[PDB]
Every structure is written in structure tokens, then in C-alpha cells.
Design brief:
- The structure is a monomer.
- The protein is 0% helix and 0% strand.
- The termini are far apart.
- By secondary structure, the protein is largely without helices or strands.
- It is rod-shaped.
- Bound molecules: zinc ion.
- The PDB classes it as protein fibril.
- Keywords: damage, protein fibril.
- The assembly is monomeric.
């Protein structure tokens, strides 16, 4: 699956 990190 797909991953996003929003710092
Ligand atoms: Zn994946």
C-alpha cells in the first residue's frame, strides 16, 4: 500500500 508522512 501507499504511505504519506506530513511533518
Ligand atoms: Zn505498500
Amino acid at each position: 500500500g501507499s504511505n504519506q508522512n506530513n511533518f
